Design a protein around this ligand. Structure first.
Ligand SMILES: CC(=O)O[C@@H]1[C@@H](O)[C@H](O[C@H]2[C@H](OC(=O)[C@H]3CC[C@@H]4[C@H](C3)O[C@@]3(C[C@H](OC(=O)/C=C/c5ccccc5)[C@H](C)CO3)[C@]43CO3)O[C@H](C)[C@@H](O)[C@@H]2OC(C)=O)O[C@H](C)[C@H]1O
Ligand SMILES: [Mg+2]
Ligand SMILES: [Mg+2]
Ligand SMILES: [Mg+2]
Ligand SMILES: [Mg+2]
Ligand SMILES: [Mg+2]
Ligand SMILES: [Mg+2]
Ligand SMILES: [Mg+2]
Ligand SMILES: [Mg+2]
Ligand SMILES: [Mg+2]
Ligand SMILES: [Mg+2]
Ligand SMILES: [Mg+2]
Ligand SMILES: [Mg+2]
Ligand SMILES: [Mg+2]
Ligand SMILES: [Mg+2]
Ligand SMILES: [Mg+2]
Ligand SMILES: [Mg+2]
Ligand SMILES: [Mg+2]
Ligand SMILES: [Mg+2]
Ligand SMILES: [Mg+2]
Ligand SMILES: [Mg+2]
Ligand SMILES: [Mg+2]
Ligand SMILES: [Mg+2]
Ligand SMILES: [Mg+2]
Ligand SMILES: [Mg+2]
Ligand SMILES: [Mg+2]
Ligand SMILES: [Mg+2]
Ligand SMILES: [Mg+2]
Ligand SMILES: [Mg+2]
Ligand SMILES: [Mg+2]
Ligand SMILES: [Mg+2]
Ligand SMILES: [Mg+2]
Ligand SMILES: [Mg+2]
Ligand SMILES: [Mg+2]
Ligand SMILES: [Mg+2]
Ligand SMILES: [Mg+2]
Ligand SMILES: [Mg+2]
Ligand SMILES: [Mg+2]
Ligand SMILES: [Mg+2]
Ligand SMILES: [Mg+2]
Ligand SMILES: [Mg+2]
Ligand SMILES: [Mg+2]
Ligand SMILES: [Mg+2]
Ligand SMILES: [Mg+2]
Ligand SMILES: [Mg+2]
Ligand SMILES: [Mg+2]
Ligand SMILES: [Mg+2]
Ligand SMILES: [Mg+2]
Ligand SMILES: [Mg+2]
Ligand SMILES: [Mg+2]
Ligand SMILES: [Mg+2]
Ligand SMILES: [Mg+2]
Ligand SMILES: [Mg+2]
Ligand SMILES: [Mg+2]
Ligand SMILES: [Mg+2]
Ligand SMILES: [Mg+2]
Ligand SMILES: [Mg+2]
Ligand SMILES: [Mg+2]
Ligand SMILES: [Mg+2]
Ligand SMILES: [Mg+2]
Ligand SMILES: [Mg+2]
Ligand SMILES: [Mg+2]
Ligand SMILES: [Mg+2]
Ligand SMILES: [Mg+2]
Ligand SMILES: [Mg+2]
Ligand SMILES: [Mg+2]
Ligand SMILES: [Mg+2]
Ligand SMILES: [Mg+2]
Ligand SMILES: [Mg+2]
Ligand SMILES: [Mg+2]
Ligand SMILES: [Mg+2]
Ligand SMILES: [Mg+2]
Ligand SMILES: [Mg+2]
Ligand SMILES: [Mg+2]
Ligand SMILES: [Mg+2]
Ligand SMILES: [Mg+2]
Ligand SMILES: [Mg+2]
Ligand SMILES: [Mg+2]
Ligand SMILES: [Mg+2]
Ligand SMILES: [Mg+2]
Ligand SMILES: [Mg+2]
Ligand SMILES: [Mg+2]
Lengths: 217, 67
RNA sequence: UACAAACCAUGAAAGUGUGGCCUAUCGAUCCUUUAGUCCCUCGGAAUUUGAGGCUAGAGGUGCCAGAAAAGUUACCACAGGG
RNA sequence: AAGACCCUGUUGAGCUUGACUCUAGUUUGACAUUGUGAAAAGACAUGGAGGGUGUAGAAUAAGUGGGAGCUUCGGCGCCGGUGAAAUACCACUACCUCUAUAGUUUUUUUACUUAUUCAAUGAAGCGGAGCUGGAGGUCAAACUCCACGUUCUAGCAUUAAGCCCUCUGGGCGAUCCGGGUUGAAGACAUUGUCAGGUGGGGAGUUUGGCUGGGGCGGCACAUCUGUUAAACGAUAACGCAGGUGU
RNA sequence: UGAUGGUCAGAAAGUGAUGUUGACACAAUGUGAUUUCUGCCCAGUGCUCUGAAUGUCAAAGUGAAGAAAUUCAACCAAGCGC
RNA sequence: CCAUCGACCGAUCCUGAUGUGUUCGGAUGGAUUUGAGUAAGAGCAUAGCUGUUGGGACCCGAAAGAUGGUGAACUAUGCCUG
RNA sequence: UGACCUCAAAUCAGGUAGGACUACCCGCUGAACUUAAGCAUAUCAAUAAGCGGAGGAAAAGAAACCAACAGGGAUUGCCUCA
């Protein structure tokens, strides 16, 4: 039966809010990183999975971004929008292993515009991209600041080759219960992605850059 | 098919001090395992060695001793 | 056996062909099994397994309208029978 | 004297047998009765702590979500250069290993005794220890072992003599301790329930028809050709010459 | 057949016969005084003996697939087979 | 009321409109098929004869089977005492 | 020198059970003749016989009921369902 315990996660985000308001810390709010256990599966043998919905509130409170290109790009994220780019290395580079490797290891997300359909599997391809990059579906007549602020809420949950995958998002600024079920509104992918779905769970841990675990599933 | 000699352990035979050349020779037995110790299945063995060997002199060539 | 409604074979065609040129060459209820319709039911409401139905074959009864079946009696019994 | 021989009846019975169908009993297995230890091959789980590449980073990754001297210090220092992935890292998770805690865990061996099982006695002397001698040869100091009232005789042995303390009684005589009557057997037997085998010892029943009696034979029992069949058709017999289950 | 036994009894039992018994005994058969002899056959049917490896092989147990009912497989006591 | 040819209802097979939870719906028009039907109700009730089935079944009749009891005053065998 | 627990004895003090009847009633146990035109599952029949236990009635009884409705509402009996 579904091991959902919102009341369990309520007292837990408070115990997280303990080492993030009470107990001890630097002073304030940080990176929420509650974990699971993940058993009853198989990193090999079966296949793959993925699931991304833009989580209720804002996770990454200081998201890192590198808007690729200029064409129809930048011109949509000038002035009030920061970041952007000035091509330059889009004609050079492409031989330097770094710079693009630097861009990947520096900033946390790029874009996809409408001209990036070339660069992602051409100027990079085996050089980058497939190594762990996700172009952002952004164009002109779109949601703009709304759908790229929702990028902070655009989580993932893909499969690799480890029975770990206990990632999390959010920050402690959230009200007493703003998380709790917001994290539960992230478990939905993680459920449907596994084989027996709600069964392939081994444990569960409430934690951040501040806690250990407070007796959870 | 198995070469039973890989599991054999060699032991040294010592004669009593009444004789002179107490280094009689060597024997073997299956190596000591969990079920059977090599020691207990090894006691009770009898060696028949000529007395001339136990004393060096060839005058005892016609007597043979069981140890 | 002769037609009715299909789908085919053959022949230039008319025609012929619904097993063997004709007169013999074979098999119910119950059960099982396969095929068909992919249809009806499991009766508090559903899904999927399973089960049960409807139609057509096979498995067989040769004592062949189709029980499941070894002897002995001079120790013998009963109902009868010209 | 409602043939006892003979036949018929979809009537029996006594008896027999690998006839059909069963059965008491018995055998074999599993579960329960069923508990306590040790060892073996091993598997696990749980607590520890610890472990790692082929290059390149001289620096040993084995993972994936992030900042900043936390620990007086500042050894090593904290994304910027070197790798596919980074040198105090941490918040913790996730795997795996090859070391340890003495956790349950399967199969084989042997220890226990309290369940269960066998036997005896008017539940009489059990278990352990100690006195006394006989030995070991003592080589420190008495450790080990043995014995601890009866054997020429077809008699007798029963309700303590004696000693100590005074307490018409207490003790020794008759060594102390444990109140397990004493052996055997033992978690196996046995017993309970299913399961496989065996089971004329026993139970129930059956064991065609036609037929010049019945039986044996044959099939005239389902059938086909020609004829008997007597000029439509029909027509019997264990009539004639033959055929079918392919 | 050496008693945790042979043969037999009982529906069961903390139940019985042999048994106040112990192989010179009890129990089961065949033949049938004495004399002289009891030949060949163990292939059949029984009875009996070993089971180290070993075909078949129940329930329980084990493994796998499945959502499960279930299915499949390995192992498999005695007996049969040898 | 008789023979005959039709119509309607249900089952079976064929066709498959507007439409649609796009797989449901099933208009319309057909078919040597089929029902114990419709097609201006005839039934319900009581009684009687005759006929049917189950019953003791027109009356009497077995050899057998089962359940529960009574006998070793005869007689078979053992024991005890004469 | 006294409690407690367990277990005994008494012609202790005072009580209570047994046995009977058969038509009905509550249970256990349990056939076969018979029918099937044979017969074994089946039927006779959850019947006869055998055993235990009551009363004027016994038993059952105030839902771990029936339902599938617009819901009924302890048990029992008749009529019906059938
Ligand atoms: C092998 C043996 O010696 O005995 C078998 C027996 O095992 C078999 O018992 C079956 C048994 O048979 C029956 O109960 C009857 C079914 C129909 C009757 C008869 C028996 O079979 C008949 C006769 C003949 O079909 C057969 O014969 C059938 C054999 C069969 C085998 C297995 C499964 C089903 C049928 C007709 C075609 C119609 O069917 C029928 C009309 O007489 O049904 C059970 C469901 C089956 O499991 C059961 O099968 C087994 C292995 O036990 O019955 C056969 C007649 C016997 O030959
Ligand atoms: Mg034609
Ligand atoms: Mg047939
Ligand atoms: Mg048929
Ligand atoms: Mg139902
Ligand atoms: Mg339904
Ligand atoms: Mg129909
Ligand atoms: Mg016939
Ligand atoms: Mg006939
Ligand atoms: Mg005679
Ligand atoms: Mg005669
Ligand atoms: Mg005679
Ligand atoms: Mg006559
Ligand atoms: Mg007569
Ligand atoms: Mg007569
Ligand atoms: Mg007849
Ligand atoms: Mg008979
Ligand atoms: Mg007979
Ligand atoms: Mg008789
Ligand atoms: Mg018996
Ligand atoms: Mg047994
Ligand atoms: Mg046992
Ligand atoms: Mg002693
Ligand atoms: Mg005694
Ligand atoms: Mg013992
Ligand atoms: Mg046992
Ligand atoms: Mg037993
Ligand atoms: Mg017994
Ligand atoms: Mg049996
Ligand atoms: Mg028999
Ligand atoms: Mg018989
Ligand atoms: Mg017959
Ligand atoms: Mg006859
Ligand atoms: Mg004949
Ligand atoms: Mg004629
Ligand atoms: Mg002829
Ligand atoms: Mg032929
Ligand atoms: Mg004897
Ligand atoms: Mg003989
Ligand atoms: Mg002879
Ligand atoms: Mg010869
Ligand atoms: Mg022979
Ligand atoms: Mg023989
Ligand atoms: Mg073997
Ligand atoms: Mg099995
Ligand atoms: Mg299984
Ligand atoms: Mg099922
Ligand atoms: Mg075997
Ligand atoms: Mg054998
Ligand atoms: Mg029809
Ligand atoms: Mg359409
Ligand atoms: Mg419509
Ligand atoms: Mg009509
Ligand atoms: Mg009419
Ligand atoms: Mg009418
Ligand atoms: Mg009469
Ligand atoms: Mg009548
Ligand atoms: Mg009548
Ligand atoms: Mg009569
Ligand atoms: Mg009679
Ligand atoms: Mg009878
Ligand atoms: Mg009687
Ligand atoms: Mg008498
Ligand atoms: Mg009194
Ligand atoms: Mg009183
Ligand atoms: Mg009474
Ligand atoms: Mg009668
Ligand atoms: Mg009859
Ligand atoms: Mg009759
Ligand atoms: Mg009869
Ligand atoms: Mg009935
Ligand atoms: Mg009955
Ligand atoms: Mg009965
Ligand atoms: Mg009665
Ligand atoms: Mg009574
Ligand atoms: Mg009264
Ligand atoms: Mg009254
Ligand atoms: Mg009452
Ligand atoms: Mg109530
Ligand atoms: Mg009611
Ligand atoms: Mg009522
Ligand atoms: Mg009616």
């Amino acid at each position: 039966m579904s091991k959902i315990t919102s009341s369990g996660v309520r007292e837990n985000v408070h115990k997280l809010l303990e080492y993030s308001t009470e107990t001890k810390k630097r002073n304030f709010l940080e990176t929420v990183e509650l974990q699971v256990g993940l058993k009853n599966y198989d990193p090999q043998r079966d296949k793959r999975f993925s699931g991304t919905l833009k989580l209720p509130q804002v996770p990454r409170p200081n998201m890192t971004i590198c808007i690729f290109g200029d064409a129809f790009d930048v011109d949509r994220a000038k002035s009030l929008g920061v970041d952007a780019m000035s091509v330059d290395d889009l004609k050079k580079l492409n031989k330097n292993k770094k710079l693009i490797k630097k861009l990947a290891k520096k900033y946390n997300a790029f874009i996809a515009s409408e001209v990036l359909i070339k660069q992602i599997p051409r100027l990079l391809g085996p050089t980058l991209s497939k190594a762990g990059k996700f172009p952002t579906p952004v164009s002109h007549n779109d949601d703009l600041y709304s759908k790229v602020t929702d990028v902070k809420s655009t989580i993932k949950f893909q499969l690799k080759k480890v029975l770990c995958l206990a990632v999390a998002v959010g920050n402690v600024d959230m009200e007493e219960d703003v998380l709790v079920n917001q994290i539960m509104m992230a478990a939905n992918f993680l459920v449907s992605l596994l084989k027996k779905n709600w069964q392939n769970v081994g444990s569960l841990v409430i934690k951040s850059t501040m806690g250990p675990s407070f007796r959870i599933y | 098919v198995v070469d039973p000699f890989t599991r054999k352990d060699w032991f040294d035979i010592k004669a009593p001090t009444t004789f002179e050349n107490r280094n009689v020779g060597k024997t073997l037995i299956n190596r000591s395992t969990g079920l059977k110790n090599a020691a207990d299945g090894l006691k009770g063995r009898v060696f028949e060695v000529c007395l001339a060997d136990l004393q060096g002199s060839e005058d005892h060539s016609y007597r043979k001793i069981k140890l």
